[PDB]
Each structure stands twice: as C-alpha cells, then as structure tokens.
C-alpha cells in the first residue's frame, strides 16, 4: 500500500474523531511503535480501572485522565500518527486480551468506559457527525418535546451518571442531543420505557445505547480474534510482547539505616517479609536475596554499603561469604561479568517467580500469605475491619497489586514496583517533615 492510499484510507476511517475500530488497521509499524503504543494505551486502561475500583465520580475520572491523555495517547488532534496510534494500539490490545474471559471482560469494561469518556469529551457538533457515521433531532424538535424527553430520561441519567441533583440533570439534558429512529431498532429499550416514542419513532440516553452496542460488537470481535490467534502464534516477535502485556494485568541509606523504623516504615509488604526473614534466619535463599538486593539497590544502597549490610546480616564465616556471596552481590550491582547494571524487580517479575515454600520469604505476600496472617498484619497496621475486608476482597480476585496500593494509601493518608512504593512513601514523609 502506497502511503497515499494509506493516508486516504485512514482519512476515511477517521472522518469522525472517535471510532468503533470496525476495520482492521492496514500498514506497517516498527515493533517499538507496536510496543510503546500498546503500553501507553494499557496504562490508560489500568488508570481507568484503578479509578473505577475507588468508585470515583465520572467527572473526577475525566479530570484525572485529561493529563495522561495529553501525555500518552493524545486525542482531539488532527495528527495522522496519533490516530494511527489509537487504532493500532487498540487492535494490539484486542490481540492481548482475547485469551481469557476474565481478561476480555476487563478489556470490554475498560474500553467501554474509555469510549464513554471520549464521547463525552467531544463537542456536540462532533458528537453529531460521529452518530451520523441515526438522525439527530433539531433544536426546535428537541424543545417541542423537551418535557417528555426529560421525563423519560431522568431516571436513566440519575442511575447511570449518578447525577443525584435535579439542576445537574437539567444542565446535562440541555446539552444532550437525541436520536430519532424507528422503535423497531430500539425494541429492547422500548420494553423498559427507556426511550420516548411518538408516531412510531423512538427518541433515544443515547450514550448508553452507543456504549452497549460498542461493548457487544467489541465482545464479538474479541471472540473472533481469539479464534484466529492460533494462526498468529507463528511469529516470534509478537508473542513475548503479548504475554507481557497480558500478564502485566497481575549516604542516608547505609548498612545500618535500612533496619531503622524511619526507613523500613516505608517498605511494602514484600520487603518487610524479606527482612523479617533475613533477621530471624540470618540468611535468605537465592530468589529472596536477589529481589531484596535489587530493591535495596533501587532505593539507593551502594555496592559497598550493601556488601557491609550483607556481611553483617549473615551472623556465616567471612571466607564462605567472600568465596560464595560477594561475587553475586557485586554482580547484582553490575561490577562483575558482563557489567550489566541489573534492574530492580517489579511486581510482575516478582510474581512471575515460583511460589515460596518452607523457609522461603520471597515473592509477594498478598499472594503467598493465608488471609489470617494478612488480617493480623493489617490489624497491626491500624487498618479498620472494613479496610481489611476491602484489602482481602481485592486480594481474593487476583488483584494483588491494587490491594498493595490500597494498604499504601490507607496507611499514609497504582503501584506495581516496590521501589515505587518506597519512593512515594519517602516523598510523603519528607513532605510531612
């Protein structure tokens, strides 16, 4: 495809500033664009989901999501590369989240919510030309039937957009366009008295209809892509990326100052467990050593202070230590072998490691600990019973990381990296001081 044909075809695909992602994207991308676009949209989705799990209002969610809209996946722009980004990233995520029903449900709700925000963020004229691409009613016709439309749609607005105040509902109604169409295409809404009818025409609360049709169509396409995926597994460059974004859904600092309350009060649960175990057993095995060493390296423990900290913690013989552990503890600091400055471990990589048995303390406690031990810990962390129940709820679903964010915020006032936990805690502590 010549880039001119691609430009004309995309202009046709983007006659409206929002889309139903009907036609598969055509063209070539370079795998960085694949990956960066996928991760940008994926972070938007995870932000949306985190806002939802906190039951914030849709206006608040719009306000929070405006800035990273201007950052990662810009909208309301005439750029061809931004629109290429939106299409190709959404279709890559359809590839990613088609594998499991729980994932496809998550993608459907997330993309449904994102679509709702996007549709609210366009001006009324662009909303009209999007609906056209279903005849919007004139302002005279809207004013003539204003009372009956308001009576029909007030309950739906109150129960779907949470506009408990009559004045807010009236303001929203004044700006809301309506669609005139046969009732035969809106029978499901008709049976529930959700749509106002005159002379065989239905006056659609339209955004809920467009959202539901988008959700259903999206779900059907998701099932189609899940059917065709075993023809996509043949290419090597794609599957690791898809697996990573699919599963991703799951000196002041010195050898001494780490063990103090001022510093370890900031550590997440994984680090607290790791140092509890180190202090009691005077030893951690391979995985625990690696993850705690790299966490310390992230928080700012230099190679020398880490070597002193590890030697003093192993209360065994320095000879043994020097033969066996110093080489590893330097290599994790990038002073041996290929000198690759090894990266600290994030919750995805921590959770990808095998489960702890007897004597192991590594991994994430929110997944490894029985609910009684977590309850005792959180009761020690002055968390109230409702707070503990919510944490156990998020933990039961398989949303360990969300529950980690919850305990963090609840004990201080979306975190999937222990150093990020520590650093946000430190930023709050310095601010408090």
């Amino acid at each position: 495809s010549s880039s001119e044909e691609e430009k004309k075809l995309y202009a046709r695909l983007y006659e409206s500033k929002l889309s139903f992602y009907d036609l598969p994207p055509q063209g070539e991308i370079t795998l960085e664009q694949f990956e960066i676009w996928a991760i940008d949209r994926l972070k938007i989705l995870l932000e949306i989901e985190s806002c939802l799990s906190r039951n914030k209002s849709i206006k608040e969610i719009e306000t929070i999501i405006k800035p990273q809209f201007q950052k990662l996946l810009p909208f309301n722009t005439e750029s061809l590369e931004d629109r290429k980004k939106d299409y190709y990233s959404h279709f890559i995520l359809r590839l990613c989240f088609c594998r499991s029903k729980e994932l496809r449900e998550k993608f459907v709700r997330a993309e449904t919510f994102l679509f709702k925000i996007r549709f609210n963020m366009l001006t009324s004229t662009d909303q009209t030309k999007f609906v056209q691409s279903l005849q919007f009613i004139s302002n005279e016709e809207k004013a003539e039937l204003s009372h009956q439309l308001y009576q029909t749609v007030s309950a739906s607005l109150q129960f779907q957009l949470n506009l408990n105040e009559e004045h807010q509902r009236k303001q929203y109604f004044q700006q809301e366009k309506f669609i005139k169409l046969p009732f035969e295409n809106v029978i499901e809404l008709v049976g529930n008295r959700l749509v106002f009818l005159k002379d065989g025409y239905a006056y659609l609360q339209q955004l809920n209809l467009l959202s539901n049709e988008f959700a259903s169509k999206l779900n059907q396409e998701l099932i189609k892509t899940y059917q065709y995926l075993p023809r996509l597994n043949e290419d090597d460059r794609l599957l690791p990326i898809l697996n990573h974004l699919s599963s991703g859904y799951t000196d002041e600092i010195n050898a001494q100052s780490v063990w103090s309350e001022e510093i370890s009060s900031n550590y997440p649960l994984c680090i607290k467990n790791l140092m509890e175990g180190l202090k009691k057993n005077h030893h951690l095995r391979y995985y625990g050593r690696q993850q705690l060493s790299l966490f310390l390296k992230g928080i700012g423990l230099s190679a020398d202070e880490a070597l002193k900290f590890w030697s003093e913690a192993f209360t065994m013989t320095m000879e043994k230590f020097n033969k066996e552990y110093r080489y590893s503890f330097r290599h994790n600091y990038g002073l041996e072998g290929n000198r690759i400055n090894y990266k600290p471990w994030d919750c995805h990589t921590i959770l990808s490691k095998p489960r702890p048995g007897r004597g192991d303390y590594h991994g994430c406690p929110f997944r490894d600990w029985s609910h009684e031990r977590l309850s005792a810990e959180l009761r020690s962390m002055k968390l109230t019973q409702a707070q503990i129940i919510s944490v156990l709820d998020s933990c039961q679903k398989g949303e360990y990381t969300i529950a980690c964010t919850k305990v963090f915020e609840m004990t201080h006032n979306h975190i999937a990296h222990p150093n990020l936990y520590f650093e946000r805690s430190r930023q709050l502590q310095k601010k408090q001081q």
């Binding site: 099932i223 059917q227 030893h283 043994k320 095998p354 192991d360």
Partner: protein, 886 residues
C-alpha cells in the same frame, strides 16, 4: 470377485440420467466384511461351511480353511481369549559407508508362549526360550573362543554364522517354527522392520514370508509404499512396538523414549547403554567386546518385552480395539484416526446411515505440583452440549462460520450416545472395583476402565483431524471454544481456592498445591477435582503425577522428584569429566534432600568452596579431570582442528574412532591439553587448569541447575576518525571528552584542532549504521541453552531448533531486531538536540577509564553550543532517521 474387470471400481460421479451419485465406490473388503457382519475387534468367530481341503500350502499356519460366503461367519459372546505366543525381537545394525546401507549383525529372539491377557501379567516373566544369532561384522570368521565363552557368560543360546545370508535363513526358519502371535520390540515399526525387510530383499532368502503368516515365494514387483508392503508382509503377527505413537501415548513421562529411559521410567530400574559400533575394528578379533555387545542386545530384548508387559500395551490396545471395532493392528501401529474412523463407521452403519466414501511458570517449584488430566475434556463437551452432525444447525457453504449449540429441545445423536455409553461402562467398571476383592479381577477392572477413558479421550480425533473421514470444522470450532472456556473456568476456580495454574493446555494442567505433604497435596487435588466436577457434572479429571520438587522449563523439558530420578539432562556425560559429574550429582542430592534448603544450600556452598580450593591446590586425583571424545573423522582433515583439544593431542601423538582422553593443563585452550597418562606422570610437571574446568565444566552446568538509560545499556558507541591526523575517538554528543570538542564553529578534534565539516561527520555516522546493518543481515544465531551456546548463521527449516544434535535450546538471532533497533535509537539520541541540552545522554566513559575527561562542561556551555550547532545536529539526526524510518 468378478470374472471381468475385478480391479475397476465405480466412480461416485458416474454420468447417468436416472441417478446422480454413487456411494461405496471404493469400499474396502475388510471394511464391508466387518460392518456387514457386525464384527467388533478380536472376538471368537463361529464359522460354518468351512472348507478343509480347498487350501493347499498357502500359509505358515498349520490350519487352513475357506468359506464360500461371508454370512457363514458370525460373532460369539465369549469374553475369554486363548494364550498369546509373543516373541521379543531386537536388532543391532551396521551402517555400510559404501552403499549407505544398514546391515544386520545380531538377532536376539526371546519368546513368551503363554502370555495371557485374561490375568495380570506377573512382573519379570522369564521367557520360555532365548536365542541370539550373530554374523561377523567385518570378516568371515569370529574371534577364537567365542562359542564356549558366550556359553560361559551369556544366558540363552547363541548361534554363530559365517555370513548374514545363513543368518537370516535361520532367523526365518526359527520364526516359522516358533509361530508366535505378537512381535514385541522397541522402535520396530519405523526402523527395524524396514531395515530387516530391505536386507532380506538384498540377500534373496527363500523364506522371507515367515515374518508374516501368508506364504509367498516372490517379492512385490514395486518393492512410501515400502510401509504398505512391509505391513502386508508381516500380516497375521501383530507388531507391538513400544516407542510407536501409541506406545508413546501410554508413557507421557518420558522425553526421549529411548530404551533405557523407558525402562527407568516404567520399571524403576537403571540400565546404562553401551554405545555400539560394529564399524570398529576391535569387533573382529576381540571376543569380549563382541560378547558385551550381544549381552547388550539380549538385555535390550528382555527390557523391551518387560516394559511392554508393564505399561499394559497389549491389553490396552485390545480393549481400545474391541471398543472401536477396527483391527487390532490398526490400533497398535497407528494413530487415533483409525479407531475414531471405525467406531463412527459402525455406529452410523448400524443405524441406517450412509457413511462417506473412503504457559509454563519456569523455575524451581518447591510446593507439591500435580499433573491433572484434561483428556476427557472434548468428550465431556460433546456429550454435555449434544454436539453432533444431526443436532447442530450450521452453514455448510462457509465452514469457518461458528455454529450455535443445539437447544435442549433437540434430541441426542449417535456419537454423543457412544460417548455416554463409554462413560457409563467406565462407571459400572468402577462400581465393580469398589466391591472387588480378588486382585486379578481388580487389575482387569483397572485395564478396562483405562481403555474406556482412552477411547473417550481419543474420540476427538474423529472430527478434529483434518484428513479425517468425518471432518467437520464448525463443530470442531464450537467444541474447541467450549473447551477453552472450561479451561479458563478451571483456572479461575483454582485461583478462587488458592492454587496456581503452573502450566496448562487442553490435555493436562499442572497445579501448584502449595503444600509439602503427600496427603495434603492429594487432598487438595481431590478437592479441586470435586470442585470441577461440581461445576461440570461430566468432566471427571484425575491426578496422574505428583511432583514434590519441579525444575520446569516446558511441558517436556524438566527435572523433578516424582512420587509413586532424572530424565532429559544426563545424555552428555562424555564431555564432562568425573569431577564435574560428581559435583553436579552431589549438588542435586543435597538440594533434593530432606534438609532445610538454607542449610542444604550452605552445604552445597561449602562443597563448592572446598572443590575450588582443591582444584586450585590440585590435590584431586588426575583421574577425575579426564575428558573422553571419540574421533568421527581423521585428525588431519578436521575443519577447525585448532579449536578442539583431541586433534591437538592426537596430532602430537602422530585414527578416526579412536578415543582420546585429555586434561586441560596450565596459550589456546585447545593447545594446553595433554595426554591423560602424560598428566599423571608427575615428572612431566603437568597440572590441570583450574580456570577452564572451573568456568566451562563446573560453573556452566550448575548455572542451569541452580537457576532511556536502561534501553541502551547493551548498545555500542560511535567511533569516528579525525580526517587530518587519523585520531579515532568515540562521540557522545555535547559532553566532555579528551579527544573532541564542540566549538562555536562546529565539532573540533583536540589533537590537531581541525574541525569536522558536516559531510565528514555524517559520512562516518552512516558508515557505522551500514556496518551494523551488514552485521545484522549476516544473520548470526546462537543457542539459548547455556551448555551449547554455539554461534551459527545456518537456519534450520524449523527456525527455532538448535542444530546441536538433540539439544533443546531455543535459537535466537544474536543481533536481534531489538538490539539493532535500539542501537539505531541510541544513534539517534546521540544527535537529539533536546536530549543533548538536558544532558540525558548515555555515557561513553567509565570513571576508571584511562580516557575519562579531565574537564567537565557546564550546563550553560552545553546549551549554548547546542543552540549554535543545531543545523549540524539536525543533519546528523536525519542521516540516522533515513534508516530508522526504514
């Protein structure tokens, strides 16, 4: 049988004005014989009107009868069967380099004439007869004293022959005399029967048909048809091959299915194979080596027969055949297609129907892991949702269109009726178990239940296989999506009761129980089984294998400690010295011990420190350092002869096949090797090399055993040349250096102060991009397995298979599109004005580098020099973008 045109069939598309389609044009005579007479596999046959005088000298059987019409033969209800005469066969071959022909040297015949499937086979049956034939592999005479000495140490009888011709003549005669009923041996079907038939064809023995039961004097004129001809030749005597597809289907635990591995896995006994090669000259005058060879052959024959008794191959195939109604041989030496074909043929034909014309969580898992069986997934779906050809409404114009499941008002079909019938028979068999006291009848119930479950599980091969007689893509897609949904809901249930899906597919899923006691893991697995059966009434999964400790890398590449041993990692013992094997084995023993794995790990650690000290001080026996390697070709013609040490030692001595034993001493790694017996001699002043054996032989295996700034951390720097004085120096953007200075008039070398005009810089940038791209298109591939690690540019047609023989690594293009793309991205960032101003650039020099810059630029100087040098930077950036945008 017709007087004229017996060989011409009737095409289905025969032109006619009264009809327009013909079925049964290409029916098989056995197929119609079995379908019409309602035969179902091997059973007692009542045959009337048998002619006892018409057949003269037509077979190798003693009893010869004939019938005049098929209606004379009817099936009886008798469930007992006579004792089977099994014969165990094993062959040692010799590849002739001249004609590339595999030649037969020794035969080991072990017979078991009273093998009864009605009763449990008692372990380690001794054969009723043992025979072992052998012919000279090189000359026409054997080493002196072979006969008496083999009588002294080998069991059974050994028969010596001057050549392979009288060899095979006596083999055929002994087969005719024995008249066994089932032939048993390992990898017979696809290698040994083929080579045996070929070498028989070559030698022109009169009695070749004795391998089968039909007497023929001449070969087929046309002798892939080789398989059909051989299988027809051996007709009458079932070929019971243990490594064939079905024999592999009854041992999921193995990884090579070599005879020793199968023996260890199924009989829990150890056997160390002797690598045999009759090309070696020692087998023509050294009697002991030949007799060790024959002993290896005899031990293989007994091992094969015993394992085939132990996995219950014959009984399971018999019951699968009685279930699907096909021939027994089509079950033994085939795939699921034959059984899934014949049972559907029978089921539809007896109901007045017209049939068609003919991902892992790799690492070390400490918790108990269970192998839980989803073999009965697809039959469970088919029965539950009544998915059948006569129930589901589908579009036959477009086969990819996914159909909907029939509403409950629709009635059941034929195939799901078979599935429910099979499930019910398994349940009644289990009810009989729950009361049965006699162990014999109880193991009979075991076998019947297992065959029923195997048929139910293999039922999906009727319709899921593409070339299958009843292929149906819409139904296959429906069943498959439903199974995928059920597998998901199993994952969700496992999470809902606090287990992990360690690895899983439509066949089997292994689950992290999270408990370290056998009873606790069994209870967790049974609870999960109850949970899944509650959510899916017909899906009855079981526990197949219990893993206390699991070193997992794939479905079929792992090490673990099973509950009722290493598989997949011990093949390479030649390359590794005695010390390395002792180290690996002691490390494994301590790690897999019942001690606390922080004290077992410290014990490993003390062992490693002590062994490092011992190697460095060289107080270890020189015997422990020896490395053996066999020479495939002559040492003078070895390509790359300077890199493997055996060539160095052998040429210092100065044939192929001679074993060189060597020690890396303390110049090239290949060159430092010395003769092992030379290194023992202390007066030669030769000591082993601590570094080599400590890095490559001891660190490498245990490394497997014990298993914007970030992006560019592995990217390389841009080396320019100064045009005037020829001074080469890296370029790091607008930063400090001892070699280059960015002035207000452009980039300036510091050795001669001569400026770089934009051409002299972009030409060199683009020369480096072109060098990198030439390197990336050179196509260097590597092996991910650290013990192989080879460097290669060849690409095997399967792209991701390493070419090291049987090595299980995953090949990857060394200069990946990831490294290459990132290199070009760092090349871009070297010329990004915003990055240069923000001092975000990757550093060229380390603080210990002798060329670390003495003078550090200030922020204001960098910003001003970037603003004065924007045009140069932009042209340099576009030079790179002209490839990044490609």
């Amino acid at each position: 049988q017709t007087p004229k045109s017996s060989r011409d069939t009737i095409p289905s598309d025969l032109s006619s004005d009264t009809f327009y389609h013909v079925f049964g044009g290409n029916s098989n005579i056995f197929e119609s014989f079995v379908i019409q007479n309602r035969i179902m596999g091997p059973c007692w046959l009542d045959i009337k009107g048998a002619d006892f005088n018409s057949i003269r000298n037509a077979s190798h059987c003693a009893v010869e009868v004939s019938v005049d019409k098929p209606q004379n033969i009817t099936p009886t209800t008798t469930k007992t069967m006579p004792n089977l005469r099994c014969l165990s066969l094993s062959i040692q071959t010799l590849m002739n380099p001249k004609e590339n022909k595999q030649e037969i040297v020794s035969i080991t015949l072990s017979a078991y004439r009273n093998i009864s499937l009605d009763s449990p086979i008692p372990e380690n049956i001794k054969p009723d007869d043992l025979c072992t034939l052998v012919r000279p592999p090189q000359s026409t005479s054997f080493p002196l004293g072979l006969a008496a000495l083999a009588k002294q140490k080998l069991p059974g009888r050994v028969r010596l022959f001057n050549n392979e011709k009288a060899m095979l003549s006596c083999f055929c005669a002994m087969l005719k005399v024995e008249d066994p009923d089932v032939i048993i041996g390992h990898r017979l079907q696809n290698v040994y029967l083929d080579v045996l038939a070929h070498r028989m064809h070559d030698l022109n023995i009169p009695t070749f048909s004795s391998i089968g039961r039909r007497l023929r004097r001449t070969w087929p004129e046309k002798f892939n048809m080789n398989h059909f001809f051989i299988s027809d030749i051996c007709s009458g005597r079932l070929i019971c091959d243990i490594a064939n597809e079905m024999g592999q289907s009854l041992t999921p635990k193995c990884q090579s299915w070599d005879l020793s591995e199968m023996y260890q896995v199924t009989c829990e006994k150890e056997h160390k194979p002797l690598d045999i090669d009759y090309q070696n000259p020692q087998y023509q005058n050294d009697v002991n080596s030949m007799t060790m060879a024959l002993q290896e052959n005899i031990t293989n024959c007994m091992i094969s027969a015993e394992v085939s008794y132990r996995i219950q191959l014959l009984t399971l195939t018999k019951q699968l055949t009685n279930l699907a109604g096909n021939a027994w041989a089509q079950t033994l030496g085939g795939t699921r297609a034959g059984r899934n074909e014949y049972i559907l043929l029978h089921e539809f034909s007896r109901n007045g129907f017209i049939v068609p014309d003919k991902e892992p969580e790799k690492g070390l898992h400490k918790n108990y892991v269970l192998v839980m069986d989803f073999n009965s997934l697809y039959p469970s779906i088919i029965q539950e949702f009544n998915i059948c050809f006569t129930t589901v409404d589908r579009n036959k114009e477009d086969i990819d269109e996914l159909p909907s499941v029939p509403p409950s008002e629709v009635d059941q079909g034929v195939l799901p009726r078979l599935l429910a019938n099979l499930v019910d028979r398994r349940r009644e068999v289990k009810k009989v178990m729950k009361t049965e006291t006699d162990p014999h009848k109880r193991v009979q119930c075991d076998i019947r239940q297992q065959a029923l479950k195997l048929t139910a599980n293999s039922m999906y091969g009727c319709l899921g296989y593409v070339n299958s007689r009843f292929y149906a893509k819409p139904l296959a897609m429906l069943v498959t999506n439903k199974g995928r949904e059920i597998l998901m809901n199993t994952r969700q249930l496992a999470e809902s009761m606090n287990l992990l899906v360690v690895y899983g597919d439509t066949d089997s899923v292994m689950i992290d129980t999270g408990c370290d006691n056998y009873a606790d893991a069994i209870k967790i697995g049974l609870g999960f089984k109850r949970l899944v059966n509650e959510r899916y009434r017909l899906l009855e999964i079981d526990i197949d294998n219990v893993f206390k400790k699991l070193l997992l890398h794939a479905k079929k590449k792992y090490a673990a400690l099973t509950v009722n041993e290493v598989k997949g990692l011990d093949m390479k013992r030649r390359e590794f010295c005695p010390l390395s094997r002792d180290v690996s084995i002691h490390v494994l023993n301590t790690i897999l011990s019942d001690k606390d794995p922080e004290e077992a790990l410290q014990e490993v650690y003390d062992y490693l420190e002590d062994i490092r000290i011992k190697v460095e001080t060289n107080n270890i026996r020189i015997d422990k350092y020896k490395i053996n390697m066999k020479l495939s070709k002559d040492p003078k013609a070895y390509p790359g002869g300077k890199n493997m040490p055996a060539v160095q030692v052998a040429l210092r001595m100065r044939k192929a096949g001679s074993v060189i034993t060597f020690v890396i001493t303390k110049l090239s790694v290949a060159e430092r090797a010395h003769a092992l017996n030379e290194v023992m001699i202390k007066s030669n002043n030769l000591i082993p090399d601590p570094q080599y054996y400590l890095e490559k032989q001891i660190f490498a295996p245990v490394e497997r055993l014990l298993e914007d700034v970030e992006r560019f951390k592995d990217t390389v720097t841009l080396e320019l040349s100064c045009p005037s004085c020829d001074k080469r120096f890296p370029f790091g953007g607008i930063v400090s250096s001892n070699y280059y200075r960015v002035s207000y008039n452009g980039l300036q070398c510091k050795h001669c102060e001569q400026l770089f005009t934009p051409l002299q810089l972009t030409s060199q940038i683009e020369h480096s991009i072109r060098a990198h791209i030439s390197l990336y298109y050179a196509g260097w591939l590597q092996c991910d397995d650290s013990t192989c690690g080879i460097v290669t540019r060849q690409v095997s047609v399967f792209g991701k298979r390493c070419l090291n023989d049987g090595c299980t690594g995953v090949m990857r293009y060394k200069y990946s599109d990831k490294q290459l793309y990132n290199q070009l991205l760092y090349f871009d960032s070297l010329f990004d004005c915003e990055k240069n101003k923000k001092q975000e650039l990757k550093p060229i020099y380390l603080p210990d580098d002798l060329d670390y810059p003495k003078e550090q630029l200030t922020e204001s100087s960098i910003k001003a020099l970037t603003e004065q040098n924007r045009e140069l930077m932009e042209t340099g950036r576009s030079v790179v973008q002209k490839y990044l945008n490609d």
